[model samples]
Target: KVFGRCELAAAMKRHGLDNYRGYSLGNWVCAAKFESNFNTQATNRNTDGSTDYGILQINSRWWCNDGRTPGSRNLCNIPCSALLSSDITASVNCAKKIVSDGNGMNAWVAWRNRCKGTDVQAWIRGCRL
Candidate 1:
């Protein structure tokens, strides 16, 4: 599984996440911290008939299909469970595609609510990246 903020930041940089789509690495790191605390296995079911999957908390209603979640848009063409894998490749890739849609970090509520105010540089402060 992925580790803490520094390791995750390094990994994200290694994965070409530097200022991707005009978003800073701190944005991604802070969002990850609040959304799932860097735990890929984390899953939180929402009352809006959708489930948040993986570290980025992608919604099953639009991004991935979970089979049981009817009417899923499945825009990423991947299973929701794939995001829960410890590998994190699928999850990160899906997050990229979602971000590439042009909304930037606004795609994540965790980012908007907790990582906002342009005050998230602390997320990457200790990272070697």
Candidate 2:
């Protein structure tokens, strides 16, 4: 499912992403825009044979168990399939786990190069938060 920008914002906020680990809802909304364009079913395979799954692109290399990645570790203890679900609850939980694990938002290069250290408020501007 592809979510609208503000719709994603409100969803993430409800999942406790507002000001989560000092990262605002805009930051998450911005990252999702670049990461998967708010598409829950998105998946991209890396050169190393690991696949990134879902809206926020949780990786099979270290975050999810895809049952095929050569050096996979289920840090989030979730199946990669869960990230593809349109519900987004598991995606939000894994994202929080990534931040809670001390990687900050920098865990996602898309977030770093795109959403980091920039004025991200526009990502959520005029949204009825």
Candidate 3:
């Protein structure tokens, strides 16, 4: 788990997510804040049997193949277990790919329900992103 927001921001920026794929750092941070509370190993099973994976809570319904979403295309092409690791390389890469699909952060229910239409400045406050 991350110690604080600053640490998370630095790691994310180091992975080139400071201004990734035309999205702002705060956007990612805010999404992360609610998705996993900055815990990389975070995972959750949805009522529909699909699960949310890792720090960004990527859904298995379309992003990853956890054997939950039948006939899923596995757009990220990475194992769901990879996202459970502390290294966020796979997670960030997968998220970037998802955004490029033109769905943006709307792909995340947490982003749409919790972060949308809100000021996320505090998500990166005191961080040098």
Candidate 4:
């Protein structure tokens, strides 16, 4: 059966974390909150009314040209979106990539610093691969 939002949240609670594997859940959750206000079903639009979709506020065009509808799978490749769609493994995996990638968790770090009251540069400096 296709899982709904509650199932998705449960899945995230089950696998979305790994004991501060790279970034803390506090960090990721802070980012998600900043990005989409913790609304797992959030979507937005440009002044032209082009639709951007999902909790992480992934622009549909970035992953798929079409916008999010009732059964959209724009996240099938983005992976992080799958976390919002009831696949926590994909969420954790995507977070791992972001933290370990050379980009050095810029956005995540920024969120931690700005939203969660952590120091971005200090956290990045202390972050281990």
The candidates, ranked best first by TM-score, are: 2, 1, 3, 4
- The residue pairs in collision within model 3 are none
Query: Model 4 TM-score?
Result: 0.47
Ten contiguous residues with the weakest lDDT in model 3: 1-10
Q: Write the per-residue lDDT of candidate 2 for residues 26-101, one digit (tens) a residue.
A: 9999999999989999999999999999999999999999999986799889999999998999999999989888
Clashes of each: 0, 0, 0, 0
Candidate 1 whole-model C-alpha lDDT, 0 to 1: 0.87
TM-score of each: 0.93, 0.97, 0.89, 0.47
Off by over 4 Å in 3: none
lDDT tens per residue, model 1, 43-115: 9998878999998999999999988778779999999999988777888889999998978788898789888
With candidate 2 superimposed using the best TM-score fit, by how many Å does residue 110's alpha carbon deviate from the native?
0.8
Better of 3 and 4 by lDDT: 3
**lDDT of all predictions:** 0.87, 0.93, 0.83, 0.47
Tens digit of per-residue lDDT, candidate 4, span 1-129: 233333333444466553445554445554565666656555576554445444445444334345343344443465324545533455455555545546444635336456555742332233332
Off by over 4 Å in 2: none
Q: Write down the worst ten-residue block by lDDT for model 2.
A: 99-108
Give stretches of model 4 more than 4 Å off: 1-13, 19-21, 45-52, 60-96, 108-113, 116-129
